[PDB]
Design a protein around this motif. Structure first.
Motif, PDB file in Angstrom:
ATOM      1  N   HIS A 116       0.838  -1.184   0.000  1.00  0.00           N
ATOM      2  CA  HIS A 116       0.000   0.000   0.000  1.00  0.00           C
ATOM      3  C   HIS A 116       0.877   1.239   0.000  1.00  0.00           C
ATOM      4  O   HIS A 116       1.754   1.374   0.858  1.00  0.00           O
ATOM      5  N   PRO A 117       0.659   2.161  -0.928  1.00  0.00           N
ATOM      6  CA  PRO A 117       1.593   3.276  -1.099  1.00  0.00           C
ATOM      7  C   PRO A 117       1.797   4.088   0.158  1.00  0.00           C
ATOM      8  O   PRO A 117       2.878   4.661   0.350  1.00  0.00           O
ATOM      9  N   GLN A 118       0.793   4.146   1.028  1.00  0.00           N
ATOM     10  CA  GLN A 118       0.898   5.019   2.186  1.00  0.00           C
ATOM     11  C   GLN A 118       2.042   4.613   3.100  1.00  0.00           C
ATOM     12  O   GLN A 118       2.672   5.479   3.712  1.00  0.00           O
ATOM     13  N   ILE A 121       5.028   6.237   1.522  1.00  0.00           N
ATOM     14  CA  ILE A 121       5.138   7.678   1.690  1.00  0.00           C
ATOM     15  C   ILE A 121       5.413   8.032   3.141  1.00  0.00           C
ATOM     16  O   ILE A 121       6.099   9.016   3.418  1.00  0.00           O
ATOM     17  N   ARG A 122       4.892   7.254   4.089  1.00  0.00           N
ATOM     18  CA  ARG A 122       5.226   7.491   5.489  1.00  0.00           C
ATOM     19  C   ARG A 122       6.716   7.326   5.718  1.00  0.00           C
ATOM     20  O   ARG A 122       7.361   8.164   6.365  1.00  0.00           O
ATOM     21  N   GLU A 507       8.204  15.125  -1.302  1.00  0.00           N
ATOM     22  CA  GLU A 507       6.773  15.281  -1.510  1.00  0.00           C
ATOM     23  C   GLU A 507       6.389  14.911  -2.932  1.00  0.00           C
ATOM     24  O   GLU A 507       5.253  14.503  -3.178  1.00  0.00           O
ATOM     25  N   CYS A 510       5.833  11.303  -2.713  1.00  0.00           N
ATOM     26  CA  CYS A 510       4.551  11.130  -2.046  1.00  0.00           C
ATOM     27  C   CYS A 510       3.410  11.306  -3.031  1.00  0.00           C
ATOM     28  O   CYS A 510       2.544  10.436  -3.165  1.00  0.00           O
ATOM     29  N   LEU A 511       3.424  12.417  -3.760  1.00  0.00           N
ATOM     30  CA  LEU A 511       2.342  12.725  -4.679  1.00  0.00           C
ATOM     31  C   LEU A 511       2.204  11.652  -5.742  1.00  0.00           C
ATOM     32  O   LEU A 511       1.113  11.113  -5.961  1.00  0.00           O
ATOM     33  N   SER A 514       1.048   8.336  -4.514  1.00  0.00           N
ATOM     34  CA  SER A 514      -0.301   8.415  -3.970  1.00  0.00           C
ATOM     35  C   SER A 514      -1.374   8.444  -5.049  1.00  0.00           C
ATOM     36  O   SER A 514      -2.478   8.942  -4.800  1.00  0.00           O
ATOM     37  N   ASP A 516      -3.493   6.093  -7.962  1.00  0.00           N
ATOM     38  CA  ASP A 516      -3.777   4.761  -8.475  1.00  0.00           C
ATOM     39  C   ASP A 516      -4.293   4.750  -9.897  1.00  0.00           C
ATOM     40  O   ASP A 516      -3.964   3.822 -10.638  1.00  0.00           O
TER      41      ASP A 516
END
Lengths: 522, 532, 527
Positions: A116-118, A121-122, A507, A510-511, A514, A516
């Motif tokens: 899961h991408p989150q 990114i975390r 970031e 992240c972007l 984030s 799909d």
């Protein structure tokens, strides 16, 4: 004959999931390759021509990306990061893009795993925060130290930032000019003051820094060649109001019975202009500039009485001038007084490459200068201007923040070591992401050496080995083709550049990660 | 400077080849492992073809880019050699190519990578032969069932895997064959497979004998014979030609009638010679004329026409009959001998799905095995026959090489770490290639997990942890293990679980993958030519 | 996975060449430019003839013009065009060979790239070589600072720089023309001169030798009224910008005549104002007048009535040339006109220069005039334009000499000695920059080769002999006997050239080619 009802427009493209994300990663990598070669003391520049046929060469990556009008959406984010860094800190926009793409590159194999991408990114956010803190810890000031002149750091900063663009072999020269120039900018600190003048022709070694203001412009009226063009210790009068026979003043119909009154009317108009001119002369000044056009007759009078004048001067240069000689621009000739009259050490107007320029300089209290930028290539004009703009804005940031770090990727190597060691502490999925963070981050020296044509594996390996223990600021030396303490070698870049670079790249990852799926509308 | 096409060099073409390889990989990435999900192809005109076996997919998928054709041909070869692993070998090749390029994408000289790869393959096969498991101690039918049903998952029939494995092992043991005088070679494709839509595979039946996809020639002629009189005959049955050029010229008309008479009486006497032997069953690839049919009816024998040559050869091998291209002798006279006859307990044509097919049960000379499939549509039936053909292939490999490998990716599970440790030995740059070989080869568990849709990194990490523990404290009789599963989404011991694969699968797979990587990696420029 | 995607629009037609292939392509293009240019160098050189888009023609030798009129499409061709333009409008001729230097240098650079040397080091070495070349050059410079009033070192210099243009027919005469003009208009106290003060003017007709400088101003108008006398001995001159019309304040204005007497007063005023202005100009003591704008015919006559010839519709720049030549001023009214502002000259005389065409006006002013004009005559419009460009370049070079009073004997000896100095340094070079040094020397060696080639001699026998002599002796005064005279002492041959000329040329070329090496990747959109 019924038909099924569609959900969205015909041809509404959609693509969801892991294929979508990996496609975005590949697109970012493609963008990288368009810029990969660029940075380096032995780095690179590109030439891009528009559909209009106008050529444009550039070494600053952000300019190039602006020229490469990207259609694919994800890459538009990268190009926007290019604009951001360009507006913030300067070169390394190149480096910014490479960091972003390489972060994505290292992550993508793990994206092949259904993570899961989150989580990614975390990990990215945590790593970036830690990295920024580490940089700020290992930041270097000089005003605490003893052997710094308030400019030497600035001079070496220009030294470092310059030696990738088109003027690299004149850095020892241009650094001195730009540092001395920006020293005059205080305290407004804004770029609009010092203009850049792209004079055609000449070798750029002959490019001039004037402690004053010059014009690439003039305009021929009747007597403009008649009046003397030397004024040793003149007074500068600055008129915004035009000087011409009700040319574009208030629109009015007039009615006159007596012929003699009609005579008086025309006489009174010319008396208007004569009154203005008398105010100008009796002011005691000899040099007059105007945003608005100048009447030929007024030029004739200045010629007869040995005043110099000029019209239609662009407003920006006029503001430069008034800030230079201390005078204030005027629109009412009547309210004139000596207080608003600028003064200069000496005034001139001398040929450079066929063009007719104007000079006045030597004003001891002048907070704005200008660059006469000789050069035989029109394209050099834009490229040198871009390089100079980078230099000026970066040295401005440096004056603002007395923080310097070593160059040559040594910062990135130090961060790589620090983050890799930290990764051992945190168990689980975070550890691999931190490792990939470091492995992507190390790219900068690799691209440097590749554009240098070295075995960057030997360089990288020696780098890591020596940099585990022996000193912080070891990094790539282009000419010696191996490691050196670039800090003592004076490869000095403001911390802000790398800090903002890392934050933006973080970031960006992240972007991009984030996302799909994507929806297109005709 | 070549007309009719440009050229590409260096980084561009390298990336292009990797891009194509990744495309081909993703084409089949979803059809491997006990949770693999099969593919299907709307051809262009509706004749679809469901299949998960990769080589079939690649063959039926048109390809234009060169390297992709290379991979397709590799898959075809692998199928010609193993039967599965087309589930895997394409993925292995693509992943190795990807990571090798990623090394090269930096700078790394390709030939160094190639040498590292060669070393990796040799080290890997040696370590496998130190990792082998021998079935001789293990119960034969047990491990055979295990290998079968292991192959049976990732396929349509994995659920009935137990029944299907039982049937397959019975067939393969029934197709024993004595080879070069020292080998018990077992012929694949010797077992006959017939598809018949209708009932379920539940009712799909094994035939202790051989089965024909043919019909009775003459409806009046009987249907079932409990006697074994089976004669084969390649020689076709027509009122014969003059067969080369022989013109017949008449100057005395009195004989045309007798001429025509023997024109059939020749076949008549041939038939009578055949039947006087007492043969009640005849087969013939060649044509069969009504003249012969009526004679047979009056004799009540069994006749079949237009049978495929391979089938009748198998018939001869089973019943012990002799293939006869004609009637002849060491002496010129055309005779026929009962010794030419083959035997089988009973021969029946039977109606399966309102189509009569011919069965041959229990040839006494040599036991034969045939399998009938029952299913819903032709799509499911022919895809499951592909599956069964792969089954027989892998079981043949197991019998031929008394050696087995723990399934479920234990192979690269061990290989990654073992090669990781061995890498530091070289000391050159090539250990980087070694490490990338290992990491790339770690792809199989990743694909397994993603197709099983759980946290893949965590499963892979646990696997690596277990194997690394198996490489600490060399007292590994209680510290060496092996295994990986998906259905419960956690590791196990496949040796206990019965998840086994034949060794030759992984061995030949890695070898061919290495060769493919060597071929494609050495590329650095394509030059295109628009056609004539 | 595998599928096409859009990155840049028109993705099919956005072509791209990258790396060494691109570099070699660029060098090929530059070499093509160099070959096109080579034949235009040297007095033995041959010039080009251009065809305008609109079908116009032009024959010229000035390389700046050659590239300017060219319609190139490949980008670096445009870069060389702009190169030549910059070099010219900085200096003058030399563009006769600047791009030649560029092309030969880039050729030999490609020679190095073939051995895999990275371009950046090549650029750095070339910069070092250029610095060495210029410092040796200005060591071996002669100077004209120590010269007496510079009459014919300047004459010799013009003689040289005109050895390349077809106007060489009487090029002695044009040399005196150029030197006299610039010396007249030079501001020695400043070391500059504005060419706006120089009035270039070529009128077709007559011989080429007829071309003559006029210490004055020549104006493309005849007299306002045809009956006025053609010659005037005195030159009391008036310079006016107000048209000889009833004044009209240009604010939107118009009168409102109402009565009989109103109209009668207006009618009286109409002629009263003309009489007023006539009386004004007469009482001023002037003799001849010039107006910026048109006349009312009535004042045209009345002006004729008082023996005051005048000119109508004179363009600005010409007017101020008149003013400065006559020392007069520009007066905006009749009323403010006084005798002091009146212009004076020696002789003004209309010339019916054309056998059947309208006429011209010349002002043979006789006192000192900070302005002057050149009148060019000949048999061809094309030859007229060529003379214009050539003389302009001559003026430029003398101006440059005013900027710096030290020159170098031409004929190629200068850069020959430069190359020898470069080679000498190449032994104390150490590493790889050594190849850069010898590389730049051999590339620079081209100009003597091109000169000899256009001379028809065996180029290399000649240049080897030149090197041998300039080594055995210490004189950097031995070039190529371009005009076949048995002395290679161009100092005696007087073939000379400004230090600034070659110095700017070589430095500019170095920077240009340095950038040319600096590039690797190109993305051309398909047309």
């Amino acid at each position: 004959m019924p038909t099924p009802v569609i959900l969205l427009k015909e041809g509404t493209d959609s693509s969801q999931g892991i294929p979508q994300l990996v496609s975005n990663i590949s697109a970012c990598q493609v963008i990288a390759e368009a810029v990969r070669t660029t940075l380096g003391p032995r780095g690179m520049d590109k030439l891009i021509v528009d559909g209009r046929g106008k050529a444009t060469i550039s070494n600053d990556g952000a300019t190039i990306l602006k020229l490469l009008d990207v259609v694919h959406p994800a890459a538009k984010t990268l190009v926007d990061i290019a604009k951001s860094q360009d507006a913030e800190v300067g070169d390394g926009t190149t480096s910014v893009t490479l960091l972003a793409a390489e972060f994505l590159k290292q992550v993508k194999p793990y994206v092949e795993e259904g993570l899961h991408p989150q989580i990614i990114i975390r990990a990215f956010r945590t790593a970036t925060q830690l990295a920024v803190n580490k940089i700020k810890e290992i930041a270097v000031t000089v005003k605490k130290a003893d052997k710094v002149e308030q400019r030497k750091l600035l001079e070496k900063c220009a030294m470092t930032a310059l030696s990738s663009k088109l003027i690299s072999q004149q850095k020892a020269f241009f650094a001195k000019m730009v540092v001395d120039a920006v020293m005059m900018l205080d305290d407004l600190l804004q770029l609009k003051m010092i203009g850049i003048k792209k004079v055609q022709g000449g070798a750029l070694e002959d490019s001039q820094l004037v402690a004053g203001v010059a014009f690439k412009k003039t305009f021929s009226y009747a007597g403009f060649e008649m009046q003397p063009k030397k004024y040793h210790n003149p007074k500068i009068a600055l008129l915004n109001v035009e000087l011409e026979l009700k040319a574009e003043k208030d629109n009015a119909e007039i009615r006159v019975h007596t012929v003699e009154d009609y005579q008086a009317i025309v006489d009174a108009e010319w008396n208007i202009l004569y009154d203005k001119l008398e105010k100008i002369h009796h002011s005691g000044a000899k040099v007059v500039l105007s945003k608005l056009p100048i009447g030929d007759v007024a030029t004739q009078y200045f010629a007869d009485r040995d005043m110099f004048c000029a019209g239609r001067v662009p407003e920006e240069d006029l503001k430069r001038t008034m800030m230079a000689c201390g005078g204030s621009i005027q629109t009412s000739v009547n309210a004139l007084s000596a207080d608003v009259l600028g003064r200069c050490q000496v005034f001139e107007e001398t040929q450079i490459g066929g063009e007719r320029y104007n000079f006045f300089t030597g004003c001891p209290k002048a907070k704005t200068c200008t660059f006469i930028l000789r050069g035989g290539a029109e394209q050099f004009m834009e490229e040198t201007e871009r390089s100079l703009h980078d230099a000026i804005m970066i040295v401005r940031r440096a004056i603002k923040n007395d923080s310097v770090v070593a160059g040559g990727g040594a910062i990135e190597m130090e961060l790589s070591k620090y983050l890799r060691d930290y990764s051992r502490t945190i168990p689980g999925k975070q550890q691999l992401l931190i490792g990939a963070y470091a492995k992507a981050l190390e790219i900068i020296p690799r691209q440097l050496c590749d554009n240098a044509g070295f075995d960057a594996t030997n360089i990288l390996n020696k780098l890591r080995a020596r940099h585990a223990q022996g000193g912080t600021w070891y990094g790539v030396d282009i000419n010696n083709e191996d490691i050196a303490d670039n800090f003592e070698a004076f490869v000095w870049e403001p911390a802000m550049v790398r800090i903002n670079a890392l934050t933006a790249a973080s970031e960006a990852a992240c972007l991009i990660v984030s996302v799909d799926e994507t929806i297109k509308n005709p | 400077l070549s007309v009719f096409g440009d050229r590409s060099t260096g980084e561009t073409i390298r990336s292009q080849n990797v891009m194509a390889a990744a495309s081909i990989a993703n084409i089949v990435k979803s059809s491997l492992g006990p949770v693999g999900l099969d593919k299907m192809l709307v051809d262009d005109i509706g004749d679809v073809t469901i299949t998960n076996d990769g080589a079939t997919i690649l063959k039926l998928l048109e390809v234009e880019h060169p390297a992709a054709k290379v991979l397709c041909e590799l898959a075809d070869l692998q199928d010609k050699e193993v039967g599965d692993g087309t589930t895997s070998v394409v993925i292995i090749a693509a992943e190795l190519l990807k990571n090798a390029d990623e090394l090269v994408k930096q700078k790394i000289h390709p030939t160094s990578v190639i040498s590292g790869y060669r070393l990796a393959c040799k080290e890997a096969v040696r370590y496998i032969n130190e990792n082998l498991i021998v079935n001789t101690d293990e119960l034969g039918r047990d491990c055979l069932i295990n290998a079968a049903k292991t192959s049976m998952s990732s396929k349509i029939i994995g659920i009935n895997g137990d029944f299907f494995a039982n049937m397959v092992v019975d067939a393969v043991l029934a197709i024993k064959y004595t080879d070069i005088r020292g080998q018990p070679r077992y012929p694949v494709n010797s077992v006959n497979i017939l598809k018949a839509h209708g009932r379920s595979q539940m009712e799909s039946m094994l035939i202790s004998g051989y089965a024909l996809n043919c019909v009775v020639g003459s409806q009046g002629m009987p249907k079932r014979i409990v006697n074994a009189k089976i004669a084969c005959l390649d020689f076709s049955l027509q009122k014969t030609k003059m067969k080369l050029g022989v013109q017949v010229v008449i100057t005395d008309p009195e004989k045309l009638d007798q001429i025509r008479q023997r024109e059939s009486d020749i076949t008549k006497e041939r038939i009578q010679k055949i039947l006087a032997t007492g043969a009640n069953v005849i087969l013939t690839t060649g044509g069969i004329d009504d003249m012969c049919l009526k004679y047979f009816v009056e004799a009540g024998a069994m006749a079949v026409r237009r049978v495929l040559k391979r089938d009748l050869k198998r018939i001869a091998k089973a019943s012990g009959a002799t293939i006869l291209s004609t009637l002849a002798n060491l002496e010129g006279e055309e005779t026929f001998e009962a010794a030419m006859l083959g035997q089988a307990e009973e021969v029946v044509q039977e109606r399966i799905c309102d189509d009569e097919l011919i069965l041959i049960k229990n040839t006494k000379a040599r036991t034969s095995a045939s399998i009938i499939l029952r299913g819903a549509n032709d799509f499911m039936c022919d895809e499951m026959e592909r599956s069964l053909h792969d089954a027989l292939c892998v079981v043949k490999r197991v019998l031929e090489s008394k050696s087995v490998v723990p399934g479920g990716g234990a192979v690269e599970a061990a290989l990654s770490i073992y090669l990781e440790n061995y890498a530091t030995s070289m000391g050159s740059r090539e250990q980087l290639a070694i490490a990338e070989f290992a990491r790339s080869l770690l792809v199989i568990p990743n694909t397994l997990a993603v197709n099983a849709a759980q946290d893949s990194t965590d499963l892979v990490a646990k696997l690596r942890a277990f194997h690394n523990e198996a490489q600490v404290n060399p007292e590994r009789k209680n510290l060496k293990w092996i295994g990986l599963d998906l259905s419960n989404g956690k590791p196990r011991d496949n040796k206990q679980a019965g998840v086994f694969e034949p060794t030759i699968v992984k061995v030949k797979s890695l070898k061919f993958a290495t060769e493919a990587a060597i071929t494609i990696l050495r590329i650095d420029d394509l030059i295109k030519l628009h056609p004539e | 996975y595998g599928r096409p995607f859009l990155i840049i629009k028109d993705q099919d037609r956005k072509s791209r060449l990258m790396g060494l292939e691109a570099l070699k392509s660029h060098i090929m293009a530059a070499k093509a430019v160099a070959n096109t240019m080579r034949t235009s160098l040297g007095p033995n050189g041959l010039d080009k003839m251009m065809v305008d888009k609109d079908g116009d023609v032009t024959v010229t030798n000035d390389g700046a013009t050659i590239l300017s009129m060219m319609d190139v499409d490949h980008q670096i061709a445009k870069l060389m065009v702009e190169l030549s333009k910059s070099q010219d409008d900085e200096i003058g001729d030399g563009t006769t060979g600047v791009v030649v230097l560029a092309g030969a240098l880039l050729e030999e650079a490609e020679q190095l790239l073939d051995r895999g040397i990275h371009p950046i080091r090549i650029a750095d070495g070339y910069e070092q070589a250029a610095r060495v070349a210029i410092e040796h050059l200005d060591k071996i410079s002669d100077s004209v600072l120590v010269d007496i009033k510079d009459t014919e070192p300047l004459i010799q210099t013009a003689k040289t720089t005109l050895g390349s243009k077809v106007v060489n027919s009487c090029h002695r005469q044009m040399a005196e023309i150029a030197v006299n003009a610039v010396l007249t208009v030079a501001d020695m106290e400043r070391r500059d001169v504005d060419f706006e003060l120089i009035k270039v003017e070529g009128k077709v007709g007559g011989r080429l030798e007829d071309t003559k400088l006029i210490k004055g101003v020549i104006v493309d108008k005849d007299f306002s009224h045809p009956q006025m006398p053609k010659k005037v001995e005195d030159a009391k001159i008036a310079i006016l910008t107000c048209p000889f019309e009833p004044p009209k304040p240009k604010t939107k204005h118009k009168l409102d005549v109402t009565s009989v007497e109103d109209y009668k007063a207006l009618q009286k005023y109409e002629k009263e104002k003309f009489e007023e202005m006539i009386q004004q100009i007469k009482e001023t003591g002037a003799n001849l007048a010039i107006c910026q704008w048109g006349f009312d015919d009535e004042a045209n006559h009345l002006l004729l009535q008082n023996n005051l010839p005048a000119v109508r519709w004179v363009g600005g720049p010409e007017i101020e040339l008149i003013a400065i030549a006559t020392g007069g001023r520009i007066v905006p009214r009749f009323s403010e006109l006084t005798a002091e502002k009146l212009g004076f000259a020696g002789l003004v005389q209309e010339i019916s220069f054309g056998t059947t065409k309208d006429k011209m006006l010349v002002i043979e002013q006789c006192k000192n005039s900070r302005a002057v004009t050149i009148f060019i005559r000949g048999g061809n419009k094309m030859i007229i334009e060529e003379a214009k460009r050539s003389l302009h370049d001559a003026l430029c070079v003398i101006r440059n000499l005013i900027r710096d009073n030290r020159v170098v004997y031409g004929g190629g000896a200068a850069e020959i000695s430069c190359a020898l100095a470069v080679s000498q340094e190449a032994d104390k070079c150490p590493t790889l920059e050594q190849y850069a040094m010898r590389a730049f020397a051999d590339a620079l060696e081209v100009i003597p080769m091109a000169l000899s080639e256009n001379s028809g001699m065996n180029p290399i026998q000649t240049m080897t002999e030149v090197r041998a002599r300039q080594v055995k002796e210490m004189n950097p005064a031995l070039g190529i006997d371009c005009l076949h005279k048995g002395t290679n002492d161009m100092k005696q041959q007087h073939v000379i050239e400004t230090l600034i000329g070659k110095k700017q040329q070589i430095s500019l070329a170095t920077q240009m080619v340095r950038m040319i090496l600096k590039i690797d990747d190109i993305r051309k959109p398909g047309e």
